[PDB]
Design an enzyme around this catalytic site. Sequence first.
Site, PDB file in Angstrom:
ATOM      1  N   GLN A 168       7.816  33.025  54.678  1.00  0.00           N
ATOM      2  CA  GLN A 168       8.016  31.810  53.786  1.00  0.00           C
ATOM      3  C   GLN A 168       6.948  30.917  53.767  1.00  0.00           C
ATOM      4  OE1 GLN A 168      10.800  31.049  51.947  1.00  0.00           O
ATOM      5  NE2 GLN A 168       9.699  29.406  51.922  1.00  0.00           N
ATOM      6  N   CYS A 169       6.313  31.026  52.627  1.00  0.00           N
ATOM      7  CA  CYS A 169       4.953  30.095  52.724  1.00  0.00           C
ATOM      8  C   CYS A 169       5.337  28.905  52.020  1.00  0.00           C
ATOM      9  CB  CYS A 169       4.222  30.701  51.500  1.00  0.00           C
ATOM     10  SG  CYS A 169       3.456  32.330  52.420  1.00  0.00           S
ATOM     11  N   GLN A 170       6.323  28.541  51.371  1.00  0.00           N
ATOM     12  CA  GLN A 170       6.609  27.226  50.892  1.00  0.00           C
ATOM     13  C   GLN A 170       6.982  26.218  52.183  1.00  0.00           C
ATOM     14  OE1 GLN A 170       9.328  24.928  50.704  1.00  0.00           O
ATOM     15  NE2 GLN A 170       8.269  23.560  49.055  1.00  0.00           N
ATOM     16  N   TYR A 179      16.747  29.383  54.047  1.00  0.00           N
ATOM     17  CA  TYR A 179      17.227  28.871  52.743  1.00  0.00           C
ATOM     18  C   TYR A 179      18.229  29.657  52.159  1.00  0.00           C
ATOM     19  CZ  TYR A 179      12.954  25.862  53.170  1.00  0.00           C
ATOM     20  OH  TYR A 179      11.935  25.143  53.515  1.00  0.00           O
ATOM     21  N   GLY A 180      18.989  29.035  51.496  1.00  0.00           N
ATOM     22  CA  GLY A 180      19.840  29.666  50.345  1.00  0.00           C
ATOM     23  C   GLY A 180      19.037  30.944  49.443  1.00  0.00           C
ATOM     24  N   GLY A 181      18.096  30.316  48.907  1.00  0.00           N
ATOM     25  CA  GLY A 181      17.055  31.379  48.208  1.00  0.00           C
ATOM     26  C   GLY A 181      15.688  30.559  48.396  1.00  0.00           C
ATOM     27  N   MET A 182      14.691  31.558  47.805  1.00  0.00           N
ATOM     28  CA  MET A 182      13.483  31.444  47.619  1.00  0.00           C
ATOM     29  C   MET A 182      12.945  31.888  46.324  1.00  0.00           C
ATOM     30  SD  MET A 182      10.766  29.075  48.452  1.00  0.00           S
ATOM     31  CE  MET A 182       9.363  29.315  47.448  1.00  0.00           C
ATOM     32  N   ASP A 241       8.154  20.231  56.243  1.00  0.00           N
ATOM     33  CA  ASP A 241       9.646  20.706  56.751  1.00  0.00           C
ATOM     34  C   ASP A 241      10.253  19.794  57.284  1.00  0.00           C
ATOM     35  OD1 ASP A 241       9.213  23.436  56.128  1.00  0.00           O
ATOM     36  OD2 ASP A 241       7.916  23.713  57.870  1.00  0.00           O
ATOM     37  N   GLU A 290      17.810  30.332  41.666  1.00  0.00           N
ATOM     38  CA  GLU A 290      16.509  30.970  41.686  1.00  0.00           C
ATOM     39  C   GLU A 290      15.937  31.347  40.532  1.00  0.00           C
ATOM     40  OE1 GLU A 290      14.889  30.181  44.618  1.00  0.00           O
ATOM     41  OE2 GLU A 290      16.901  29.400  45.641  1.00  0.00           O
ATOM     42  N   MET A 308      19.176  26.883  57.365  1.00  0.00           N
ATOM     43  CA  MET A 308      19.132  25.368  57.910  1.00  0.00           C
ATOM     44  C   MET A 308      20.402  24.394  57.302  1.00  0.00           C
ATOM     45  SD  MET A 308      15.205  25.017  57.681  1.00  0.00           S
ATOM     46  CE  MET A 308      14.951  24.989  55.789  1.00  0.00           C
TER      47      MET A 308
HETATM   48  O1  LIG Z   1      14.772  25.290  45.997  1.00  0.00           O
HETATM   49  C1  LIG Z   1      14.739  26.133  46.971  1.00  0.00           C
HETATM   50  C2  LIG Z   1      16.215  26.962  47.168  1.00  0.00           C
HETATM   51  C3  LIG Z   1      17.311  25.795  47.764  1.00  0.00           C
HETATM   52  C4  LIG Z   1      17.912  26.133  49.053  1.00  0.00           C
HETATM   53  O2  LIG Z   1      17.503  27.011  49.894  1.00  0.00           O
HETATM   54  N1  LIG Z   1      18.428  24.993  49.325  1.00  0.00           N
HETATM   55  C5  LIG Z   1      18.850  23.594  48.858  1.00  0.00           C
HETATM   56  C6  LIG Z   1      19.272  22.643  50.193  1.00  0.00           C
HETATM   57  C7  LIG Z   1      19.594  23.695  51.383  1.00  0.00           C
HETATM   58  C8  LIG Z   1      19.077  25.061  50.876  1.00  0.00           C
HETATM   59  C9  LIG Z   1      20.246  25.964  50.970  1.00  0.00           C
HETATM   60  O3  LIG Z   1      21.192  25.867  50.019  1.00  0.00           O
HETATM   61  O4  LIG Z   1      20.194  26.558  51.953  1.00  0.00           O
HETATM   62  C10 LIG Z   1      13.489  26.739  47.600  1.00  0.00           C
HETATM   63  C11 LIG Z   1      13.513  26.132  48.975  1.00  0.00           C
HETATM   64  C12 LIG Z   1      12.056  25.710  49.312  1.00  0.00           C
HETATM   65  C13 LIG Z   1      11.437  25.882  47.876  1.00  0.00           C
HETATM   66  N2  LIG Z   1      12.563  25.976  46.945  1.00  0.00           N
HETATM   67 ZN   LIG Z   2      14.958  25.160  44.464  1.00  0.00          ZN
END
Ligand SMILES: O=C(CCC(=O)N1CCC[C@H]1C(=O)O)[C@@H]1CCCN1
Ligand SMILES: [Zn+2]
Length: 608
Positions: A132-134, A265-268, A373, A294, A562
């Site tokens: 997970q680089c971001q 995360y929910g997604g990446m 973070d 996503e 998280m």
């Molecule tokens: O934008 C996203 C996904 C959104 C995401 O995982 N979210 C929004 C707030 C909490 C988290 C989640 O839903 O677990 C990735 C996270 C780092 C960069 N983009």
């Molecule tokens: Zn996003």
Amino acid sequence: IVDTCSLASPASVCRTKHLHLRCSVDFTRRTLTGTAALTVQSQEDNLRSLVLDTKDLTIEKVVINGQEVKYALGERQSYKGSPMEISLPIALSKNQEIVIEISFETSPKSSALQWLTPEQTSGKEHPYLFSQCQAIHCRAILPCQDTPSVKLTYTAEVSVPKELVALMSAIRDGETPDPEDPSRKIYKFIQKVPIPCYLIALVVGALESRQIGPRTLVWSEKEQVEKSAYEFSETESMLKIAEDLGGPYVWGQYDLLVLPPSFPYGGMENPCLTFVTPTLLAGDKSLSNVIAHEISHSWTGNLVTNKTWDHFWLNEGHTVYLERHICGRLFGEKFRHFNALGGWGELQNSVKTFGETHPFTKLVVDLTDIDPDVAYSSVPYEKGFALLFYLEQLLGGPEIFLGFLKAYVEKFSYKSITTDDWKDFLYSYFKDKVDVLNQVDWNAWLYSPGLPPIKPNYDMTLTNACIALSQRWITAKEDDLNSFNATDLKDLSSHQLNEFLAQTLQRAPLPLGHIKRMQEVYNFNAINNSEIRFRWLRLCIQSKWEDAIPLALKMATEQGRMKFTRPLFKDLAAFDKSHDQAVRTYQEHKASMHPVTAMLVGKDLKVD
Ligand SMILES: O=C(CCC(=O)N1CCC[C@H]1C(=O)O)[C@@H]1CCCN1
Ligand SMILES: [Zn+2]
Ligand SMILES: [Yb+3]
Ligand SMILES: [Yb+3]
Ligand SMILES: [Yb+3]
Ligand SMILES: [Yb+3]
Ligand SMILES: [Yb+3]
């Protein structure tokens, strides 16, 4: 102007154009070993050195023009890592390119990576690795200009135990046995579209795939493939809607990878290979907005990119705006407004949590000396969203604002931009509505902490039944509890159930007899939808129901998203009956958690 999160040479000194990565995954040592060959173009006259970001990397050598060159690692600057200066053998003119080959090894403690033992996987017979680089963890995998202001293409060849599969944020370009070693395979990858380095991603495990659409495979361990195929089966319809809204999908494949439960995360939005949490696997597609989000990043974020992390709202706000338009096309405008009003609710929660004056509640943040973070939150998502929804309403409505978004995407495709770039383009596009635009309090919206100075208008149609049931529970006295019944829920969708719980959680605690009655008549304990269960368990623990303590500990530790893990642990620490247990459980689990999550849950709990 200045990327305060990167120690590397900025893009006005030089630019990486291409990475050719050759590496080997070693599960015994938990190291990635290999060579990163960076093609770097000078942006100035007489360039004789350059600086790269690194974090906890072991450098073996640097080779240019077939010879070793001198390099120097500076001292660590905490979460930013150590800058690596390289002395070039020959001075470069403006636009001249060279290839710099760096031989490196990762630390097992890499902040980019989680290494899983066989027992931490579904199948229990093979280990697993994911990246997970971001935001700024690419520097903990390979030396690079670890800044979204720089975009490169990449090719990779990855050597892995031959029983495992490697995937990356790239188009798959074949597998062969490893000619240097018969117990291993080499998987090849090509990313022909330029990307910021935070979009580099790697997974290695006992992965299988199932095709779910013309340009989409799902990948997971075998145990999850069937459920995943079903859960994400809306993907192609959403890709089609997103193309109508954003213009063509330029990345080729749109595959999905369902990670182990520790994914943070929910997604990446890794290009070609979106990473998702298995907590999406509700059984009814109800959490598919995550996929819509996503997918949306294939335009907003991955094509048009924030220049620095201070301008993260650009990536996220616009993505949430497109996500809600895809869900609105599929399910209706009243649903779009429902989800939008939910979002405002989430913004209220974050702002209350941080405080109205906290700098992390500003839309544009200043991340000088702030670990991204730590700063990460829903605020850029939802204040960003609210700004755009406000502008939509101010400027003539969704169809009109959707033409601006498509135009914005076309203007800035393949580039990295600031909030000012965006605002100038907004004014340019809406040149005939400047009078309207000047009514906007920009300094408040962009630069002030707290809730936005103005609340958009929301249709209440789908929300009213949620508010009404929430209010009946809130205002109920003991002599009213008998009137609640399972039939209360019969006309609520799963989204409505979640919103009834969100409304009620905002007023928590409720009396303990109310929460017990809620279990008695609705049987919320039986619901496996992650979002619903998360809100129910928080409501229970905040209302001091001891019976929920084991269910909350279980949810906090058995997955690692998280969004769920951090507040559950925080609620459990704040309940006297669960405080000691929450701490002990964290301490027992911390070594096998995702490194970022572990750090953050430790800060939340004020432990180590
Ligand atoms: O934008 C996203 C996904 C959104 C995401 O995982 N979210 C929004 C707030 C909490 C988290 C989640 O839903 O677990 C990735 C996270 C780092 C960069 N983009
Ligand atoms: Zn996003
Ligand atoms: Yb200089
Ligand atoms: Yb010169
Ligand atoms: Yb040597
Ligand atoms: Yb302007
Ligand atoms: Yb009464």
